[PDB]
């Protein structure tokens, strides 16, 4: 679990380097967290990587 955690953090870091607005802006981070929880409420969300979850949530804001 401890290694799984460090690797999930690394994946999250790369997504936030690809999308730097979110770590600069409280409002954007908030909107993203709202969509992120909504993705995670989807059936089968266990099967997503954190990268896939973050990208899905960001795409829901681009919609």
């Amino acid at each position: 679990f401890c290694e799984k955690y460090k690797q999930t953090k690394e994946q999250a870091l790369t997504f936030f380097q690809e999308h730097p607005q979110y770590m600069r802006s409280k409002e954007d981070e908030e909107q993203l967290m709202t969509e992120f929880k909504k993705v995670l409420l989807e059936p089968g969300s266990k099967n997503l990587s954190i990268y896939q979850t973050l990208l899905a949530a960001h795409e829901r804001l681009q919609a």
């Binding site: 999930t8 953090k9 999250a12 266990k46 954190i50």
Partner: peptide, 11 residues
């Protein structure tokens, strides 16, 4: 980062 990881691991 930690808030994103802790939410993800609880899905």
């Amino acid at each position: 980062l930690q808030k994103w990881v802790r939410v993800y691991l609880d899905r």
